Amino acid sequence: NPNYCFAGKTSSISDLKEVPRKNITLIRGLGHGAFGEVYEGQVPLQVAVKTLPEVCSEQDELDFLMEALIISKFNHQNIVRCIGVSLQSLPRFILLELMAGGDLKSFLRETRPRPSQPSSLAMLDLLHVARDIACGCQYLEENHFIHRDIAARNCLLTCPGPGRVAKIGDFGMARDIYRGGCAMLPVKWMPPEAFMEGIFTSKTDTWSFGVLLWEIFSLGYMPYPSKSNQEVLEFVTSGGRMDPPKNCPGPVYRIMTQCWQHQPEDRPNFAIILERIEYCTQDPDVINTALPIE
Ligand SMILES: Cc1nn(C)c2c1-c1cnc(N)c(c1)O[C@H](C)c1cc(F)ccc1C(=O)N(C)C2
């Protein structure tokens, strides 16, 4: 059984909390898409259940074990909790905090203000989501963990309603690297030194967070509209940057452009990003700005 080290502490599969299979009940599917299905479950404690296909390779098995180790060793309010695992019966389960709000990309798209729902979302809701994820990112940064795929699709919401809390919910890219192809690399979220030299640092996630910020304030649009992966690669490498999302306040767009500085040394760390998000949330001219109604 492979070892995992986080914050200089070493853990093993034996450290995972094995929940007896009999204590676990599947309720409904939440989707499969990527390798494996996800179900809502009960252990009563309500959970999301990530499953490993019984028809898988040994590498799929190792990948599954590693993501279990990675998530269980985090302890922060803006990272999804692992309730435990069921690895001793098949198919194997990882048990996660149930985030009833679903993933952030789907949420933004579904919760866009509309003539039917004219006040579904406000600038403050978006700033709160941004702060939440930035807090999670700061925790990773201070513990020297590089996420490598900070993106709306990988964030989750505790609930649809106003008290929602956003958390980082998927660590599959970091898992792969820790141990694929060009076409699968999240190039639209990556800085120049990442896709060119394969150099990753904390400032890798800063750049990606800027793209997430654009996703958030665009209300769920795909980054670099109308651009392919290679077109984005050449655009960004040549200094090109995304325009502000529709109705985006200047102070918010300015955080994006700072996250996208070419030199990683010129990009803010997450402490600074959090400070700027805070300042935006205080600014009436920012939060009084109306989001577009489709
Ligand atoms: C209720 C619900 N509805 N939807 C649409 C989803 C959920 C949901 C709720 N809580 C938890 N923990 C998960 C999913 O976790 C999985 C692993 C997961 C994690 C990340 F980051 C992204 C997508 C994702 C996923 O696979 N979804 C299907 C998203």
Least Cα distance to 65 among 156, 9, 3, 21 occurs for 3
Tokens of 38: 């996800």
CA distance readout (Å), 98 to 45, 53, 81, 142, 156: 9, 21, 9, 26, 9
State the Cα–Cα distance between residues 245 and 252, nearest whole angstrom: 10
User: Range(s) for CATH 3.30.200.20 in the chain?
Assistant: 1-98
Q: Residue with the nearest Cα to atom 13 of ligand 1?
A: 48
Helix intervals (H) in 7-122? 58-73, 104-110
Question: How distant, in Å, are the alpha carbons of 81, 105, 115, 118, 159 from that of 112?
Answer: 28, 11, 10, 9, 16
State the chain's maximal CA–CA distance in angstroms: 57
Pairing of strands 38-42, 25-31: antiparallel
Q: Which of 103, 98, 149, 95 is nearest to 129 (CA)?
A: 103
Count of beta carbons in the 10 Å neighbourhood of residue 81: 18
Catalytic residue among 63, 132, 149, 205: 149
Best mutation site among 26, 27, 28, 30 for ligand 1, i.e. most ligand atoms within 8 A of its Cβ? Answer: 30
What's the resolution in A?
A: 1.8
Residue 292 identity: P
- Give the technique used to solve this structure: X-ray
Place domain 1-98 in its CATH homologous superfamily.
Phosphorylase Kinase; domain 1 (3.30.200.20)
80 lines ligand 1 (CB under 6 A): yes
Cα→Cα distances 193→132, 167, 231, 236, Å: 27, 27, 16, 11
* CATH entry, 99-283, from 3.50.50.60, 1.10.10.60, 1.10.510.10, 1.20.272.10: 1.10.510.10
CATH 1.10.510.10-classified regions of the chain: 99-283
Of ligand 1's listed atoms, the one at least distance from the Cα of 40 is: 1
Q: Is 149 a catalytic residue?
A: yes
